[PDB]
Design goal:
The structure is a homodimer.
Chain A: H1 6-16, E1 20-31, E2 35-39, E3 47-50, H2 58-61, E4 69-78, E5 81-90, H3 96-99, H4 111-116, H5 125-147, E6 151-152, E7 158-159, E8 166-168, E9 194-196, H6 201-211, E10 213-221, E11 234-243, H7 247-268, H8 270-286, H9 297-306, E12 310-313, H10 314-323, H11 325-328, H12 345-355, E13 360-366, E14 382-390, E15 394-401, H13 406-415, H14 424-428, E16 437-443, H15 444-452
Helix pairs in contact in A: 5-7, 5-8, 5-15, 7-9
């Protein structure tokens, strides 16, 4: 027997008019002893079940409560579509006394309470929408790269290479040691010290030279003691790498990618986005007007798709910021530093939301504040970096054209004290038909924040990992 | 303000639309024959594009820098070839070498055009992407992965990113401690409240328990993420880090779970058959040539593509564990002690050799075994009416044995609590998992697929180190 979801029933009911069908779900509400609002997660929308209590046992009706699980057989009718229940089966326990202690209680719950009951928040209107939209973002990403001849590469998570989490098989109460008295990592599981990776990029470059176009889509980890509304210790990164792309090609790719994925969500998530759009707008009204966003959620997404990204050099951005009235008359919370420093989130957001009123790609950053692998530009002062800036979230993509010249790369590694012998294999990629090549990394959670209108990064991943929080 | 690129695959597949036009192509040299013909490859396909080089249009010093694995940008006209071995070729008009090629050092690597052992290719796993073989393997792995996402996306499943770091054979520890300055409490035990997550953390072996929480709100979910095992096992088919695909479905019972697994495997395999024709042709021969080298008695009963087509074509045999033990006990093979491990009384798990016997010799067909002895299965599996077995299932495939394991879950809170007590599973740390049985608990079921094992299966490779980019095994975490 093949089962149909509530989404299918709401979409195909005209075929079933006056037929008996079978549906399964949880009670959102059972009102006036007559109307069940039933949900199964396939859609934000509920299916109405009409219940004539005189045709059912009194003990059964009393067991229809908020969050109860039901199997229902009944006739498809129009009020619009609803089921006239003929049989109702309770599918499992519902300890209604304890429901008051959960976020399943039908009342407003704070976001941090929902966060506190992350194992249960999937059953709310809000997070059904958020996580169905997160699915659509993910599948849009795989579809975009699949259709343009990229190959999904599962780069390693455990690495022997930002502060990193150690990964060990040692009993921490019984660590083996060598002659000198140091920890003997030759006795750890991998015969060397290991950590969780911060990025699969270096492995992606090795594969780009055999497969042309690759992307990763996997977890990455940062051990910075950072407790902020936008930082996770465990998060998912999407990192394409393309042989024969230069920096300009890399920016084109990033722009095409973001616009495609956002349009996909606009196409495929209309009901969920409408809810999230209403939620965002009500959220805005509680704010003071100076903190209110100029655009609604869907409006913002449509205009990101429509607007060509502004491409601005690092050097031009610094000058704009230095000479802004906000810097000169002390309106920025953080001072604008001279050429050579990295930009503050406040100044990035200024550029996007106020100065340009448009997504901005910044590029050609001072070499000393960027990673060793970034290609050194002819000016011998900047590297071929790029950062894509979105309103509200700030940076949404970072990447660069890579340094494909062996001699130049070795000098950049020496300059930033990167061990060449431990990366012997990465240097090999510059020895045998080295190619100009470029990639970038997308923080998947940051993109989900952007398309769902949510503000806290803990509310766009199922079970967030942050300082002192690793529950569930 | 930047020209569009096209891959070699695009050129070879739509040659008539590029025909007699000039195009710009990029790639690496596979061979340079007769001082005229460059076989170029860019990873988009196993196939090479032929570049025709007239010596009189180029400096002789540029002809000498066309070496194996050299990187080239070529501008030239697409023309029909005069040679029977290809339909189109490029008449080069501009040739640009894109970077260094230290050809003296090239002979020490697997880029050298000669046979290299698989052990050498693993030692140079950073370079093996650039060979015919692993171009095929990893493009097929991509197609498996996209097939997997497509199958579930199209069936109203939502991709769930379950946590990798967890608070819960052995597991790897994850810590931010300085291992020489580990904090202790007044007890003298390790003060894990000072570790990054305020508790002892490990790497997950499975997201299934988190997936069940999400299935109760989303109905149908699947995970697709890395998992980790710290058993000191060094075998041809064990990894310490591998990828698991784990769907979970509300309102599915065990029969529904088996139906889903069968439909899932048949769809993914048929997708690879449809989408990976040239790569699978190469792997079909690689397998056949390997098999032909073994003694006749040691050869597999099917070729690679033949095997895949049969899994798509044959309905999986559904056989109880109890019937399976019957069959194994009465088999000539067991009666004569042919197994490494004798099959004896009902109650123990089957070895891979026993599972392969049922598939390859007794049924000649994929097999799904179900209803396993309760005491040899995880606490979460639903206890059947006989109070002796649990609603477990294992999908068994030729050559690899188990490809999927799963079960209908124990959705009754009091039964779950007892199974957890019986197996000494801590209820306190799993308070959030018990919650899923308290508020509208539902029948539900799911399973796990090891991605690397499926990739092994559809590529015809035999060592699991050859189906993941950078394998992690005991004493091996390079690259």
């Amino acid at each position: 027997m093949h089962k149909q979801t509530i989404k299918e029933v709401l979409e195909n009911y005209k075929k079933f008019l006056h037929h008996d069908i079978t549906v399964y779900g949880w009670v959102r509400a059972f009102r006036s002893n007559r109307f069940i609002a039933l949900n199964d997660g396939s859609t934000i929308n509920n299916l109405q079940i009409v219940v004539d209590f005189e045709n059912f046992d009194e003990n059964l009706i009393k067991n229809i409560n908020t969050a109860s699980s039901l199997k229902i057989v009944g006739e498809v009718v129009e009020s619009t579509v609803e089921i006239i229940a003929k049989k109702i089966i309770v599918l499992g326990d519902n300890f209604t006394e304890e429901l008051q202690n959960t976020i399943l209680q039908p009342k407003k719950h704070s976001l941090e309470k929902l966060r506190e009951q992350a194992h249960l928040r999937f059953r709310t209107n809000l997070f059904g929408a958020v996580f169905r939209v997160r699915h659509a973002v993910s599948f849009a990403i795989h579809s975009f790269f699949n259709d343009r001849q990229f190959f999904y590469l599962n780069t390693p998570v455990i690495t022997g290479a930002g502060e990193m989490f150690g990964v060990t098989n040692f009993d921490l109460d019984n660590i083996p040691r060598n002659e000198d008295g140091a920890i003997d990592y030759t006795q750890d599981f991998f015969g060397r010290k290991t950590n969780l990776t911060v990025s699969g990029q270096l492995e992606g470059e090795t594969a780009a030279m055999g497969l042309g176009r690759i992307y990763t889509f996997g977890p990455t980890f940062r051990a910075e003691n950072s407790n902020t509304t936008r930082h996770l210790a465990e998060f998912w990164m999407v990192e394409p790498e393309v042989a024969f792309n230069n920096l300009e090609d890399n920016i084109d790719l990033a722009e095409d990618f973001l616009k495609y994925v956002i349009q996909y969500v606009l196409d495929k998530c209309k009901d969920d986005l409408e809810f999230l759009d209403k939620r965002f707008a009500e959220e805005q009204k509680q704010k003071p007007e100076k903190e209110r966003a100029k655009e609604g959620l869907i409006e913002k997404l449509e205009n990101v798709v429509a607007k060509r990204f502004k491409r601005v050099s690092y050097t031009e951005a610094i000058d704009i910021l230095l000479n802004s009235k906000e810097n000169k008359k002390g309106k920025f919370v953080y001072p604008v530093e001279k050429w050579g420093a990295d930009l503050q989130s406040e100044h990035e957001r200024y550029l996007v939301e106020k100065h340009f009123e448009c997504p901005v790609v910044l590029f050609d950053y001072p070499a000393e504040i960027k990673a060793f692998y970034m290609r050194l530009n002819e000016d011998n002062k900047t590297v071929a970096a790029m950062d894509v800036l979105f309103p509200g979230i700030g940076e949404i993509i970072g990447g660069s054209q890579r340094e494909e010249r062996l001699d130049v790369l070795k000098k950049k590694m020496d300059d930033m004290h990167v061990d060449q012998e431990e990366l012997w294999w990465y240097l090999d990629t510059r020895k045998f038909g080295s190619v100009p090549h470029s990639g970038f990394g997308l923080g998947l959670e940051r993109l989900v924040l952007f398309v769902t209108g949510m503000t806290n990064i803990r509310d766009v991943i199922p079970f967030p990992r942050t300082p002192k929080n690793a529950e569930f």
